[model samples]
Target chain A: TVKLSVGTVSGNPGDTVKVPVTISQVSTPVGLICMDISYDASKFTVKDVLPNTDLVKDTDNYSFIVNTSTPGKISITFTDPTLANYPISVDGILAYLDFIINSNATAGDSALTVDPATLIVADENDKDIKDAASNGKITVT
Target chain B: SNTILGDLNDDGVVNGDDIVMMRQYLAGKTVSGIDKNALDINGDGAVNGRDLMELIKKVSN
Candidate 1:
């Protein structure tokens, strides 16, 4: 079973932090992965998202789309062109999501979770391989 | 002006659409520029399922 988990993060207001999403126990090669992340927009805003170059580089043409039109929601989708030739099986960080806490953020825990409906992983034969995802927590001090 | 406690979309009325928005927020869907004042029905400092209950009560009344 594959698992996608978001690492915990903590920082003070006005600080920028990178939350890493990692994949583990990958028994099959992944061809494409798409997921949407939701967080407390009242506390933090997205700064940027950096995909793990080590996994995506030199293997195939890739496309990444990030949508954050909603105050506390972000939708992301990433795919590779040469899925048949190059599939990833590495158990490591898939991407780094950067977020900057608002200067007026409340000192408490902010919930960050993945929308299960929009999270999916496909293997070389377009088979769904996603098993589980754990929610993330960000504490502001 | 007396504010409707559950009008999350700011549409000036409490209805099914507002309930849908509240559900999305509770489910961790971020709604940009969300008016916390409208959804914080219980006077709590957060928008959570507890607030959702207040909305349901108000809507059912």
Candidate 2:
């Protein structure tokens, strides 16, 4: 697992920043979801805003953090695009948050490098979670 | 130890014996004979202390 931190913080509440979030894996098109983007870090609710079917290019342009109001962590799922349930096939996922800095809140962008980390459902031993990523499903067969 | 809740027996098991014991206990008629093991949790020679304690504990907590 990789640990990616914020690379750039630009603009105020009324502007949107183009965050260049990257993922490190052989997989591509990791799904991007967002929300609770806060100008104030305390107001951030990780699951407030979400992306549905937002195909992110794994190598480049993985995500765009458009916080027209606040600033906080964006919840995302980087996974193999070919998998049936996508993120359900593994212990966890790897994600990195790298956004660009602009002079104006609604303006330009830049590049960033973040240490990637894993998001595991269980621990080192793959134990079944009560709520599995496949939406509370456990195959009896 | 905390008093057993809803235990008709002194040992706290819901069964025929508990039911029979509770029937008599509820009527306020003491078991007269037969060396019956009294359901006395607070040791008042009867089921009163245990019943009261259990009821109070159940309601408060």
Candidate 3:
């Protein structure tokens, strides 16, 4: 089984907070993991999802997309943006979600969720692996 | 941001070696250990010659 999780972080009103989306218990090495990361757009401004080079290599081809097509939610997707696919087969930080805490955000917890339903872990062979994920929290205090 | 903008090696100091992987990558050789994000020096969304220009700008600074 594989796992994906967003970790906890804290930030001031105007500070840029980087939260990690980590992976562990990888029974199989994957070429990519495609999923929709949902966060509170009102509380945080989604910046970018950067690959953790130590874990996932050939990042020059990895894709990080921030979609605002939906209201009230920031949709982020990370995968191969090209033909030379990189492999993610380690147990560590896979990528980071860079977010800026809104200056007017309330002092409280804003949960960042990886929609398990939308989570797809693709192996080098392009097969989907079963995986689980947990919600990460960012506190503006 | 734990890494310096163009410090690909995370050596805490900037130099041309920091971007040697970038240079090799631009030439189509397979390289590893450097963050893909760092290659996008100008944050232009694509990795190419312009990004190298930005890195050159950094070395000059």
Candidate 4:
């Protein structure tokens, strides 16, 4: 089975930090990953998203930063055009969620969560894959 | 103020230009000038692939 997990983040007011979405090994490989991550929009905003994984990096990919579409929600969609050629057996970071803590933010734990309905893991061969995902926490100091 | 569904450019019409802007936002690029309300088709509370598809269907009509 495959797993998509979100990493936690912590930063002081006005500081920049990055949270990662990591994955576990899957017997079969997938070329597409789509998910929506939710956070505290009032305290932070996304700086950018970086898909720096070896399996999906240096290839044609896509990211949808739909943060403003909803309250603190960022929908990320990544599809590796070359994943079929590179094959994935191991697990690692799939992408990073960059955020800038509000300059006047107070101390709090901002949960980085996901929407199950909006999250999809698939490939050209298989329309969907069996997997699990966990939300991460972000602490603002 | 007036609002038109799928008219992201707010030019009183839905066409390919709005689709281009929707595609860009979906592809992770910054789209600063757009009718944010038009991106959320069906009022599902989010702008996602479903809404993008809806936008296309709207344009198709």
User: DockQ of each model against the real complex?
Assistant: 0.02, 0.01, 0.02, 0.13
Error of 4 at A83 (Å): 7.2
Model 4: per-residue Cα lDDT over A53-80, one tens digit each: 5745534423223334666887776543
Return the lDDT, model 3, position A119. 69
Report the C-alpha displacement of residue A138, candidate 4, in angstroms: 0.8
TM-score of chain B of each: 0.76, 0.35, 0.79, 0.87
| Worst 10 contiguous positions by lDDT, candidate 2 chain B | B48-57
Q: What is the DockQ of the complex in model 1?
A: 0.02
**Range of the 10 consecutive residues with the lowest summed lDDT in candidate 1 chain B:** B47-56
For candidate 3, the per-residue lDDT at B50 reads 43
Q: Which prediction has more favorable lDDT, 2 or 3? A: 3
Sorted on DockQ, best first, the list reads 4, 3, 1, 2
lDDT winner between 1 and 4, please give it. Answer: 4
**lDDT (10s digit) by residue, model 2, range A1-141:** 322223244444333333333223222222222212122233222223222233333322222222222243333322222222233222222332333322232333322222122222221122212221111101111
Candidate 1 i-RMS: 14.6
Q: What does the lDDT read for residue B53 in candidate 1?
A: 43
- Candidate 3: tens digits of C-alpha lDDT, residues A37-93: 777888887676576778766556424434544544544444442323455656998
Best by lDDT: 4
Instruction: List runs of model 3 lying over 4 Å from the truth.
Output: A63-85, B1-61
Q: Against the unseen true structure, what C-alpha lDDT does each candidate score?
A: 0.71, 0.30, 0.67, 0.72
Q: How accurate is candidate 3 locally (lDDT)?
A: 0.67
